[PDB]
Design an enzyme around this catalytic site. Sequence first.
Site, short mmCIF file in Angstrom:
data_model
loop_
_atom_site.label_atom_id
_atom_site.label_comp_id
_atom_site.label_asym_id
_atom_site.label_seq_id
_atom_site.Cartn_x
_atom_site.Cartn_y
_atom_site.Cartn_z
N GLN B 15 36.73 -19.50 -19.58
CA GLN B 15 37.16 -19.08 -20.90
C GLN B 15 37.84 -20.22 -21.65
OE1 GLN B 15 38.52 -14.71 -22.45
NE2 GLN B 15 39.87 -15.67 -20.94
N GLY B 137 40.85 -15.68 -7.74
CA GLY B 137 40.01 -15.98 -6.60
C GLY B 137 39.02 -17.09 -6.88
N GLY B 139 38.83 -19.12 -9.49
CA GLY B 139 39.49 -20.31 -10.00
C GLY B 139 40.37 -21.03 -9.01
N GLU B 247 41.93 -45.01 -15.63
CA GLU B 247 43.25 -45.60 -15.83
C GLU B 247 44.37 -44.58 -15.63
OE1 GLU B 247 43.60 -47.87 -19.39
OE2 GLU B 247 41.52 -48.56 -19.36
N1 LIG Z 1 45.02 -20.78 -20.77
C1 LIG Z 1 44.24 -19.75 -20.37
N2 LIG Z 1 44.59 -19.13 -19.21
C2 LIG Z 1 43.86 -18.11 -18.73
C3 LIG Z 1 42.67 -17.67 -19.48
N3 LIG Z 1 42.15 -16.65 -18.77
C4 LIG Z 1 42.93 -16.45 -17.68
N4 LIG Z 1 43.97 -17.30 -17.69
C5 LIG Z 1 45.00 -17.43 -16.64
O1 LIG Z 1 44.34 -17.56 -15.38
C6 LIG Z 1 45.06 -16.81 -14.39
C7 LIG Z 1 44.18 -15.67 -13.91
O2 LIG Z 1 43.03 -16.26 -13.31
P1 LIG Z 1 41.53 -15.94 -13.78
O3 LIG Z 1 40.87 -17.22 -14.23
O4 LIG Z 1 41.43 -14.75 -14.72
O5 LIG Z 1 40.90 -15.43 -12.41
P2 LIG Z 1 39.51 -15.97 -11.83
O6 LIG Z 1 39.53 -17.47 -11.78
O7 LIG Z 1 38.34 -15.42 -12.60
O8 LIG Z 1 39.61 -15.42 -10.33
P3 LIG Z 1 39.09 -13.97 -9.87
O9 LIG Z 1 38.79 -13.13 -11.08
O10 LIG Z 1 40.23 -13.50 -9.01
O11 LIG Z 1 37.84 -14.27 -9.11
C8 LIG Z 1 46.30 -16.27 -15.08
O12 LIG Z 1 47.38 -17.19 -14.89
C9 LIG Z 1 45.87 -16.20 -16.52
O13 LIG Z 1 46.98 -16.25 -17.40
C10 LIG Z 1 42.34 -18.41 -20.73
O14 LIG Z 1 41.35 -18.10 -21.42
N5 LIG Z 1 43.15 -19.42 -21.09
#
Ligand SMILES: Nc1nc2c(ncn2[C@@H]2O[C@H](COP(=O)(O)OP(=O)(O)OP(=O)(O)O)[C@@H](O)[C@H]2O)c(=O)[nH]1
EC number: 3.6.5.-
Lengths: 432, 432, 430, 430
Positions: B15, B137, B139, B247
Site C-alpha cells: 500500500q 505476517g 510484511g 554511499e
Molecule cells: N505507513 C503505512 N503503514 C501501514 C499501511 N498499511 C499498514 N500499515 C502498517 O503496517 C502494520 C500492519 O501490517 P500490514 O502491512 O497490514 O500486515 P501485512 O504485511 O499484510 O501482514 P499480514 O496481513 O499479517 O500477512 C501496522 O503497523 C500498520 O499501521 C500504509 O498504507 N502505510
Amino acid sequence: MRECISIHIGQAGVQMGNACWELYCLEHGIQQDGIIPDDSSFGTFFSETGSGKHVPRAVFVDLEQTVIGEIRTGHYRSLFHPEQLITGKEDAANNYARGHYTIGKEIVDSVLDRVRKMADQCSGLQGFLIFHSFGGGTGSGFTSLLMERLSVDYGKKSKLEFSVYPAPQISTAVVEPYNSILTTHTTLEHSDCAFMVDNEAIYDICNRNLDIERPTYTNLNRLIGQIVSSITASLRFDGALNVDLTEFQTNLVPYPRIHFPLVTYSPIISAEKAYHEQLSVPEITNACFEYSNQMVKCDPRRGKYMACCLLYRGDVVPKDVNAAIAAIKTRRSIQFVDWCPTGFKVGINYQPPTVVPGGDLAKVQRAVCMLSNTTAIAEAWARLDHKFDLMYSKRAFVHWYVGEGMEEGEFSEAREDMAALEKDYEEVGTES
Amino acid sequence: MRECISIHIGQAGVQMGNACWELYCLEHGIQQDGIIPDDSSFGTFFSETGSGKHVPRAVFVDLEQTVIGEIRTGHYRSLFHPEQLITGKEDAANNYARGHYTIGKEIVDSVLDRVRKMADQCSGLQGFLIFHSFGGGTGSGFTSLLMERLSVDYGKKSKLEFSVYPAPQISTAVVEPYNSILTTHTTLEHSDCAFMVDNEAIYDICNRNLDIERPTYTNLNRLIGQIVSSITASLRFDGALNVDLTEFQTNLVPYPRIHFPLVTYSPIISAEKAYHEQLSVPEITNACFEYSNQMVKCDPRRGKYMACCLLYRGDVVPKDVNAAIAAIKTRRSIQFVDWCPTGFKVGINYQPPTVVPGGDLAKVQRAVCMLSNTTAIAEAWARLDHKFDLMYSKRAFVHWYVGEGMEEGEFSEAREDMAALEKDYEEVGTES
Amino acid sequence: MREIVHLQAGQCGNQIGAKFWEVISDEHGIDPTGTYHGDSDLQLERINVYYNEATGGKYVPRAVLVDLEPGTMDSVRSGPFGQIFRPDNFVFGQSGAGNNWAKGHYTEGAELVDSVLDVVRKEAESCDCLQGFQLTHSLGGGTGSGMGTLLISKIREEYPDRIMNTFSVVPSPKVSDTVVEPYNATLSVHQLVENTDETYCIDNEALYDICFRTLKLTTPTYGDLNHLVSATMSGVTTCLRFPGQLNADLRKLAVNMVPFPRLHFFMPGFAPLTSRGSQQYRALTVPELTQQMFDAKNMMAACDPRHGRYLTVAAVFRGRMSMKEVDEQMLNVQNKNSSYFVEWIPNNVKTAVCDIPPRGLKMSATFIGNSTAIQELFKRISEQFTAMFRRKAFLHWYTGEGMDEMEFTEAESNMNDLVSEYQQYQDATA
Amino acid sequence: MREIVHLQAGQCGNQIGAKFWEVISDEHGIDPTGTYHGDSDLQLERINVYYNEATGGKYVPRAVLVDLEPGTMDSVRSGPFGQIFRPDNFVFGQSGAGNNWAKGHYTEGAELVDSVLDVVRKEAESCDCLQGFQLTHSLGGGTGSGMGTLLISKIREEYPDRIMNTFSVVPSPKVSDTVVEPYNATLSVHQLVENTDETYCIDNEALYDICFRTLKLTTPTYGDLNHLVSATMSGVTTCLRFPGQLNADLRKLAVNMVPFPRLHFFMPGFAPLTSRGSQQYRALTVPELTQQMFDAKNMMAACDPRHGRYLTVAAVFRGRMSMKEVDEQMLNVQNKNSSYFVEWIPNNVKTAVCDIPPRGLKMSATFIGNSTAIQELFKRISEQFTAMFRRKAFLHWYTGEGMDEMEFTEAESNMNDLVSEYQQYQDATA
Ligand SMILES: Nc1nc2c(ncn2[C@@H]2O[C@H](COP(=O)(O)OP(=O)(O)OP(=O)(O)O)[C@@H](O)[C@H]2O)c(=O)[nH]1
Ligand SMILES: Nc1nc2c(ncn2[C@@H]2O[C@H](COP(=O)(O)OP(=O)(O)OP(=O)(O)O)[C@@H](O)[C@H]2O)c(=O)[nH]1
Ligand SMILES: Nc1nc2c(ncn2[C@@H]2O[C@H](COP(=O)(O)OP(=O)(O)O)[C@@H](O)[C@H]2O)c(=O)[nH]1
Ligand SMILES: Nc1nc2c(ncn2[C@@H]2O[C@H](COP(=O)(O)OP(=O)(O)O)[C@@H](O)[C@H]2O)c(=O)[nH]1
Ligand SMILES: [Mg+2]
C-alpha cells in the site's frame, strides 16, 4: 532450396498437420481455395500446376475415415489433391498389431505408390517430415511400417518426425505403454531423429504463459505448427547462416540410437500480455533453459545437455546470439557433458513469425526454437519402461495382440531393446 | 546513474508503494496509462519497451489477494507488468511463522524468479529498496525470507528498507512485539540499514504541522513517499555533490548491527499556511533537530547522534548548507558522540519537489531529508523488549507459532539477541 | 614542447576539470566545438601544450576523465562544453565507490585503472616532449581519493622522471561533508607524500571565506568556487603557454618550493579579487596587489599562515608590469614580516613574470606558499583519526574490501612524522 | 598481366565473395551492370587483373561460385549486384552437405568438383599470365571445408607453380555456431598445410570485438563483418592493380611472410577503424595509424599476439604518404616491442606503399602477421578434438560417406606437429 515431403499418419498426425498447413498457406499468402493471389520459397512445400492452384506436397493416411473426412469436407477441401487423402475402412482400435500387421499392410502399398509418384516429380528432395503419435494404432503401427518401407525405397535420405510422446501422468489410453514401446523399437533403426512433444507440458505452458484457462487440441496443435515452420524456415526463406534439413541430424545426433531431441519454443506470450515485455535476445534465449519451458515434461537439470540448436527467426542480431549463447555456457546449473565442448548450432532466417487469424499467441517480432538433446529424456523412457514391466509382468493385455498376427516374444524383445537404450544413455551420461 | 529494484512486501509495503510510484510517475511525467507523453533519469526506476510504455522496475508480493487486487484493478493497472504482481491464496494472519515457514516458502521461489529475470535485464544495478512493516505476517516473515534469499543470490549489493516500526503506545495488533522482534533478529545479519518510521510520530506531525484533523493511511503513506523520492533523488537527477545509493550505508553505519537511522523530513507545511513562512536554509535545517520533527517517536535529546545525512533538494546554496550545519554542531543540547567528530554528510540535487494532485503538503521550492542515526532509538528497542518479556514470561501466545513449524527456542534466542543489541548501543553510547 | 596531460578523478575533480578547461579554451580563444577562434598568434604557438590537433582545426584536449560510475561524466558530456573532449578519453565504471577508500583503490578501481592507463599512454606517446602529469581530485571522496592515489602510483612507476603535481580539496576544519573524511584523508596522504612532487591543498571553507568576504556574492555555488581554483591552476602553467620576461616552469616551481622531498604541500592564492560594482573604487597597481598575497584573508587553505612560518614562496605575475616593483615589493614584504619567515633560508621569494594576463584582466598573480602552519591541518586530521580509530568506528566497511587495519596504523604513523618534520623547522638557526 | 581468378565455396565464402566483388567494382568504378564508369585511367590499365572483357564494355569478373545446393547462390543471382557475374560460372548441386566434411569432399563434392574444374580451366586459358588462385571459404562448414579442400588440391595438381592463397573463417574460441566444428576444422587444416601457400585466419568473435570496441555500431550483421574482410583482402592485391612507390605482389608477401613451408598461417589486420561521428576527433597521420596495427585490439584473429612472438610482419600501405615515416615507425615499433619479436630473424617488418588509397579514404594499411601465438588456436582445436574423438562422438556421420577413422587420427597427429613446430621457435638464439 528444394522440396520436402510431409507424411501425416494417425489421428494426431492428421489433425496436427491441418493446423501446420494453415501456417504455410498464411506465410506464403496462399488462399485456402488453393489459388495463389495475383515466390521461390513455396516450391519446397507446394507443387506448381498449370492453373494458379498450388498443390501441397504431403500425404495423409488414416485407417479411420472420420478424421480425413473432416478435412476432405472442410473448407480446405480444394487445397489437397484428392488422391493424396488415403482412407481405410475400419480403425486400428489403438492396437499396435492391427496398424502394423493385419490392416496396416492392406493399405500401406497404396501410400507408397503416391509418395513414389510424388517423390519422382521433384527435381530436388531433402527428406520426410512424419507427424504421428505414440499412443494410437494408426499413428504408431502404420508409422513403423512406413519407416521400414520408405527406408528401403528412399534410404540414405533424411527421415524426421514429430511424435506426441506419452505424458508422464495424464493418459488418454490404457495401452499407451504397450503401443509406445513397440513403435520405438522398430523406429530406432529406421529414423534419423524424433522431435518429442507432450500435451501435459504444452498444457502446462498454455495455462501458465499464454494465459488461457481452457485449451483444446485445436489450440495446442497450432503451437506444434510453429515449431515445424521455424524448423523448416531455412528451406524456404533467405537469411544469414541458414540450416538445411540434413544439418539437423549431424549436430543433434552424436550416436545413431540417441536421436531424441525434445522441442522447446519461445516466446509464448499472449497479444495483451506482450505490451509489457521487451523481448531481448538473452530473454528469449534464457527462456529455453529452464524446466518451465519444454514441450516434454522432463526436468532438464536432472540430466545434462549434449547438443543444442537455436534456430533463430526474424530480424536478429548475430552478435547478440553469439554473446547470449556464451553466457549460457558458463552457468553451473546448466551442465553440458564433458565430451562435447562444442555444444551449439545457431541458425538465422530473416522472416519473423506470422500470426494465425484469431491466434492466441502474440505478434513477436523475433522468435527462437531450441532442439536440445538431453540425457534427462532417459527419465521419460525409464518411467515408461516401469509401466510396461508392471503390465506385461501380469500378461494383462497381450491377448488383444496375439490375435492380430503378433508373436508373444515381440514384447520381450522390445523391452530388452529399450533396456539397452536406458544403459546407452547412462554410459553417455558419464565420462571415460 | 543506473537501476534500483523496489520490493514491496505485505499490506503496508504494497500500500505504501502505490503512493510512492505515483510520485515517480509525476516527477518524470509518466502517464498512469504507462505511456510517456510525447529522460536519462527514468531508466533507473523504469524499464524501456518497444512501445512508449515504460515498465516500473519493482515487484509486489502479498499472500492476501485483496491488497494487490485493488492495484491490479485500480487505474494504475496497466502501469505494472502483470507477472510482477505476485499473489498467494490465503493471508499470513499476522503470524510470523506462517509468512516465514509454511506459506511464505510456498511462493518465495516464484518471487526470486521474477527478480532474477529482472536483475538480469539491467546493465547496471545499485541495490534493493524493500518496503514492509514490523507488525504483520507477510510484511515481517516474508521479508525475512527475501533478505536471506536475496543475500545469497545477490550478496554484496546494497539492501535498504523502509520499515513501519511499532509505535510506542498506539497499537494495531496484539502480537506486534512477538512479530516485531523475530524479524529484527533475522534481518540484522542480512541487511544494510533500515529507515524506521512510526505512524504515531507521523500522525503527531500531520495534526501538528500539516494541520489536517483527520489523516488516514492513504494520507500518511504519501509523506513516506517523499522521503523515498528524496533519498533516491541522487540516482536520477543531476546536482552538485550527488550521493549514490551505496554511499548511505558507509556514512550511516559505524557498526554492522547498528544500522537503524530514523527518518526525518522538512518542511511539512500546508498550501495555505506556507504564505507566511520564508523557508530559509537554517530554518529547514533546524527543523530536523527537535523532538517535534521525527517519523519515529523517540526523544532525540535522550540519546546522542552518531551519524547524520542531510540530502538537500531543489535550488540550494552550498555555502549556507555548510554554514547552517556548522551552527548545529555547536549547541549544547545537541550532543554528538565523542568518537565521531565528522558527523555530517551533505547531498544536493537540483530538482525541487513535485506536488501530488490534491496533495496536502505545500509546493516548497526547497526541501531536505535527514537520516540521523541516534542512540535514542535504543529506547524504542528497550521498550519493545519489555513488552516481549511480559508476554513470553507467561507463554501467552506461543501456541499459534509452534503449530506452524517454529520451534520454541526461537523466541528465547531472539530476545537474547535483542538484549545484546541493547548492550551494543550502551557500549557505543559511552567513550573508552 | 613540454606538453601537459590532465588527469581528473572523482566528482570534485571532474567538475573542477570541466571548469578548468573552459578557462583555458577561453584564454587560447578556442570555440566549444573545438575550432580555434582567438585573436593572438601566441595562442596557437603553444596550443599544443594542452590540445592535440585533428585535421580540420578540431583541437582535442588531452584530458583523461575517470569516475567509477557514469553519474558525473554523463553531465559533462551533456554540458555545453562537453563536445570538445574525445569520446574515448572518458572512462566510466558501473558501480561507484561508496566514499570508502578501499573499494575505489583495491576492488573497483583496480578493474578500471588498467583501462585508464591504456589511454594515458596513448596521450604520452603522442607528445614530442611530455613535461608532466596534472591531477585534480579530492581527498574526502572515494573515487578521487582511491583511484587517484591508485592511478598516481601507476603513472609514477612508468614515468618517474616527469613532474606529477596535484590539486586536491582538503577536509575543512569545522565542517565535514562526509562522515569518514579522516580515514580517506589520512590514507590518501600516505600514498601521496611518496609519489607526488607537489600538492596545492585547498578547502571549501577557506574558499567560502573568499566568496562573501573580499567578493560580495552570496550563494556561491560550487560552479563558482571551481572558477577560483580553475584560475589559480591555469596561472601555474602560464609560462609554458605564453612568453614572459621571467618565464617559470612546473619544474622551476618544484625546485624552489620544495626544500626537502616530503615537505612539498603548498597552499595557493590568487589576486586581484574584488566584488563587481565596488571594483572601480580600487587601484590595480602592483603594490596593493602584493599585499593581497601575504594576508590570511586571501589564502585558499583554512590554515592561517600567521600561526606558522614561511619556508618558500613563489609569486607568478602576469601582464605588462614593472619588474622593479615585482621585486622591490618582495624585499619590503620580507623585511616587514621577517618573523613570518624562517632564518635558515636566506631568501624565500620566487618571482616570475608573464606577458599575457588573464582574459578580461590586465594584472594577475597566483601566489604559492610552503608554510609550516599547514602542519595544523594534518595535526587536526591526526586528532580526528585517533578518536575514530580508537574504537574502530568504521573499519568494517574498509576491511571488507580486501584491506587490513595494519594499513590504518601505518598511515597514522606516517602522518604523525610528517607533522613532526614540519615542527622541527619552527626553531631558528642554532 | 598477373591475372587473379577468384574461387568462393560455401555459404560464408559466397557471402564474403559477394561483398568482396562489390568493393573492387567500387574501387575500379564499375557499374553493377558490368559497364565501367570510373574517373581514373589507372582503373582501366589494370581492369584485366580481375575482370574479363566482352564486347560492349561489359566486364565479366572471373569468379567461380560453387555450393552444393542452390540456396546461397540463388540469393546472389537475385541480389542487386548479381547480374555482373557470368551465368556459366555459377555451379550448383541439388543436395547440400549437412556440415559434415566427408559428404562435401567424397560423395557429393566429387560429383560436382569436375564441373567446377571445367570452368576454372577456361578462366586459366583466357589469361595471358595467370598469377595465382584465391579462395574464400570457411572451415566450420561442410561445403566450404570439404569442396574447398577438394578443389584446392585439384587446382594445386594442375598449376603447382602458381600462388594459391586463402581467406578462411576459423572456429571462435568460446562460441561455436556448429557442433562438429573441431572435426571439420582439423580435417580441413591437414589438407591445407600441404597444398596452400598462405592462409589469412579470421574468426567472427575477434571481428565482433572490432565492431563495438573501436567502431560503435551495435547489431553488426554478417553483411558488415564481410566488408571488413572484403577490405583487407582487397588491400593484399592493390599493388597488382594500381601504381605505387614500393609495389608488393602475392608472391612478394609469400616469400617474406613464410620462413618455413608449413608455417604459413597468418592473421590479418586493417586500419583506420573509427566510429562515424567520433571520426573527426582523431588524426589520420601515419604515426597513430601504425600503432593501431601492433595492438591486439585491432587483430581479426582471436589469438592475442602478446602471448606469442612475431616471426614476420608485412604492412601494405596505400595513398600519398611519407615513405620516411612508413619506415621510421617500423624501426621504433621493433625496438619498443623487441620482446614481441624473435631474435633469430634480424628484421621482421615488410613495407609496401601504393599510390591509390581505398575509395572514400586517403590512407589505409592492411596489416599481416605471422606470430607463434596462433599455435594456441590449433592447440585449442586439438583440445576439443581429443575430447570428442576419445568417445567417437560423431564419427558415424563421417564413416558413413566413405571414410575411415584412421584419417581422423592422421589429421590429429599432423595438427599436433604443426603446434609443436611453432613452439620450437619460442626459444631465443642459442
Ligand atoms: N505507513 C503505512 N503503514 C501501514 C499501511 N498499511 C499498514 N500499515 C502498517 O503496517 C502494520 C500492519 O501490517 P500490514 O502491512 O497490514 O500486515 P501485512 O504485511 O499484510 O501482514 P499480514 O496481513 O499479517 O500477512 C501496522 O503497523 C500498520 O499501521 C500504509 O498504507 N502505510
Ligand atoms: N498435439 C495433439 N495431440 C493429439 C491430437 N489428437 C490426438 N492427440 C494425441 O494422440 C494420442 C492418441 O492417439 P491418436 O492419434 O488419437 O490415435 P490414432 O493415431 O488415430 O490411432 P487409433 O485411433 O488407435 O487408430 C494421445 O496422446 C492424444 O493426446 C492433436 O490434434 N494434437
Ligand atoms: N571545488 C569543488 N569541490 C567539490 C565539487 N564537488 C564535490 N566537491 C568536494 O569533493 C568532496 C566529495 O568527493 P567526491 O569527489 O564527490 O567523491 P568521489 O566521487 O568518490 O571522489 C567534498 O569535499 C566536496 O566538497 C565541485 O564541483 N567543486
Ligand atoms: N564472416 C562470415 N562468416 C559466416 C557467414 N555465414 C556463415 N559464416 C560462418 O561460416 C560457418 C558456417 O559454415 P557455412 O559456410 O554456413 O557451412 P557450409 O555452407 O556447409 O560451408 C560459421 O563459422 C559461421 O560463423 C558470413 O556471411 N560471413
Ligand atoms: Mg484414430
